[PDB]
Structure formats: structure tokens, C-alpha cells
Amino acid sequence: MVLGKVVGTVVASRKEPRIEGLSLLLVRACDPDGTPTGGAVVCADAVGAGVGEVVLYASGSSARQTEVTNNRPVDATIMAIVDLVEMGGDVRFRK
């Protein structure tokens, strides 16, 4: 599970039917300051994340441990909406 800032949304119309209604989002990992620094990866939403929000996306076999993602084919999913990030006693991110 890695810090990340949502960047955009992806829409597929011809897809495996098990996933319809899933919200596909585009996330780039961000340094622990909120400054996005990484490559685009897609993941489904389970918390209602929108553009400009900082999230945690879990990946792999454990990205399915939630309804709306059970025996569905997903290897990356959101599970949190960050609220503040501490480092050594000095806050580096707020919301």
C-alpha cells in the first residue's frame, strides 16, 4: 500500500462484466509531501475518491479483500483517503 494522488479517470465500455459499476481511477504515487512523483497506474475506487485527492491504493491478491472487489479481477484498489501525514513530528501534509 503506497501513498498516491488521483490524477484522472479511465472509462472502458467493453469490459469483463463482473466489474461494471466499478470506478476506474488513475493514480500516481506521491512523495510524502503531496507532490506527485511517479507513473500512472489504474485502480478501482471503494471509498469514493475524486480528482485531487490523496489516497492509498493496495495492490495484488489483497486488493480483492473488499466487496465490490471480491472474486472480481483487480490487482490495485483504493482503501483510504489521506487526512494528514506526519514525519518526525512535523506535519508535511494536511487537507
Partner: protein
């Protein structure tokens, strides 16, 4: 004409989260909302077809977690006579 997506929820909180999740899920323009009285509220979204179809499917699943959801429907190409006589935005 821009496509058409609609979600009708008996509550109100149902509409907003349905409206919101529709917006957060695809490139859609949220156009307003329509109160038919009696508690029934309707959110109206419009945009490209593939975008609405993804937003709509997202709103249905998102409002049901609150409950209700009366009706949920998507019109790909509204007739001109509709868009001129009804408050769905794209009215000249």
C-alpha cells in the same frame, strides 16, 4: 445532442452521492437537479455516451448503499424535440 443520464432517488442524500459518484467516475457535466415533489429528486448528467454509461452504472451502485433508488436510465441520443421542451440543459 449530448447524451443523457438520469438517476431518481426518493431521499435527497441518495441523489447527491449518486450525482457525485457519477461525476467522479467519468468526464461528465452535472447539469442540475429536478424536484418532482413528494420527496422524489432526480439528478441529470450529460456528456459523451461512454462517459454517461460509466457514470450511471457508478451512481446506481453508489446510491443503493444509501438505499431507495427509484429509477435509473440513460438516453444516448435525445430527440431534438425533447431538449427543446424539457429542462435537461442543452436547451437553446
Amino acid at each position: 445532442a449530448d447524451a443523457l443520464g438520469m438517476i431518481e432517488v426518493r431521499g435527497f442524500v441518495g441523489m447527491v452521492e449518486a450525482a457525485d459518484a457519477m461525476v467522479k467516475a467519468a468526464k461528465v457535466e452535472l447539469i442540475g437537479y429536478e424536484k418532482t415533489g413528494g420527496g422524489y429528486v432526480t439528478a441529470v448528467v450529460r456528456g459523451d455516451v461512454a462517459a454517461v454509461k460509466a457514470a450511471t452504472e457508478a451512481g446506481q451502485r453508489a446510491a443503493e448503499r444509501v438505499g431507495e433508488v427509484v429509477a435509473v436510465h440513460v438516453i444516448p441520443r435525445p430527440h431534438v424535440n425533447v431538449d427543446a421542451a424539457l429542462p435537461l440543459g442543452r436547451t437553446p
